[PDB]
């Protein structure tokens, strides 16, 4: 039961972070991957990972902040990646919907990170929004030199999903699928994702599962809700939850090279 997408540096967790973490482990979660989205967040993510047991982090620059990418940024990321806690380069990718940085700025930062990851032999943690065609064109030639790649918070079409899977890319699924309103579309394709390419996450504090029975709705999501998300996904795939938990943990071990 590993959460590959915890935004643990969020201010929403400022007052009770020690509690959020202890409750996650007590609920059966055995590992958290803390997302870094720019240099300062990545440094904070690594410090949090070193502070708590069973935590690792990513180091990179999100397309939104790619405008901040400079040569000095590159050095700082390489240095951060050498730390034991940092196991993946990213969040990186492309976002042609928001365009908070120009496409030109985005491509430069994304390619520079693919390059860092290939050099260091580390997997990449990616984001893609309304940029699938260009995204795959830039990513495709780097895959044979990377240990792996995951596209987290995947909400795309089955055609995009099949293309990603055909290239050996892991697919991250959140509680988004527990929303009768927006997630039915993704829910329908869950049976199509190869078991060996599926990773689960909460994207906490966001995306609180709507079908959450306890009913603490319209609130902060947290990793302690991962088991509920996994039960649901297993149900929609026809699988046993304990079996799915073991299979996804194996995928995490395979992709990131960690013991948890
Ligand atoms: Zn995610």
Curated annotation (Swiss-Prot):
Gene3D superfamilies with a match to the protein in the record: Metal-dependent hydrolases
GO CC, one annotated term: cytosol
Null allele phenotype: Knockout cells are less resistant to the DNA damaging agent H(2)O(2).
Names of required cofactors: Mg(2+); Mn(2+)
Effect after changing residue 64 to A: No change in nuclease activity
UniProt-recorded Gene Ontology molecular function terms: 3'-5'-RNA exonuclease activity; DNA nuclease activity; magnesium ion binding; metal ion binding; single-stranded DNA 3'-5' DNA exonuclease activity
Cell compartment(s), UniProt: Cytoplasm
SUPFAM superfamilies: Metallo-dependent hydrolases (SSF51556)
Cited CDD domains: TatD_DNAse
Amino acids binding a divalent metal cation: 91, 127, 152
PROSITE patterns named among the record's database cross-references: TATD_2, TATD_3
PANTHER family: DEOXYRIBONUCLEASE TATDN1 (PTHR10060:SF15), TATD FAMILY DEOXYRIBONUCLEASE (PTHR10060)
Protein's recorded name: 3'-5' ssDNA/RNA exonuclease TatD
Species the sequence originates in: Escherichia coli (strain K12)
Recorded name of the encoding gene: tatD
């Amino acid at each position: 039961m590993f959460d590959i997408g915890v935004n643990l540096t969020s201010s929403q967790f400022a007052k009770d972070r020690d509690d959020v973490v202890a409750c996650a482990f007590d609920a059966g979660v055995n590992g958290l991957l803390i997302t870094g989205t720019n240099l300062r967040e990545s440094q904070q993510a690594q410090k949090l990972a070193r502070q708590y047991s069973s935590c690792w982090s990513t180091a990179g620059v999100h397309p939104h902040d790619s405008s901040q990418w400079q040569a000095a940024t590159e050095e700082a990321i390489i240095e951060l990646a050498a730390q034991p806690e940092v196991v993946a380069i990213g969040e990186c990718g492309l976002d042609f919907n928001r365009n908070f940085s120009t496409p030109e700025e985005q491509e430069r930062a994304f390619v520079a990170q693919l390059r860092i990851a290939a050099d260091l032999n580390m997997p990449v943690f990616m984001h893609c929004r309304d940029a699938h065609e260009r995204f795959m064109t830039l990513l495709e030639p780097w895959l044979d030199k990377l240990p792996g790649a995951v596209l987290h918070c995947f909400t795309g079409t089955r055609e995009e999903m099949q293309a990603c899977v055909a290239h050996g890319i892991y697919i991250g699924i959140t509680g988004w699928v527990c929303d009768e309103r927006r997630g039915l579309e993704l829910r329908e394709l869950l049976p199509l994702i190869p078991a060996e390419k599926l990773l689960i996450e909460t994207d906490a504090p966001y995306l609180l599962p709507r079908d959450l029975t306890p009913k603490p709705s319209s609130r902060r999501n947290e990793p302690a809700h991962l088991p509920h998300i996994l039960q649901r996904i297993a149900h929609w795939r026809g699988e046993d939850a304990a079996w799915l938990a073991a299979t996804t943990d194996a995928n995490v071990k395979t992709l990131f090279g960690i013991a948890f």
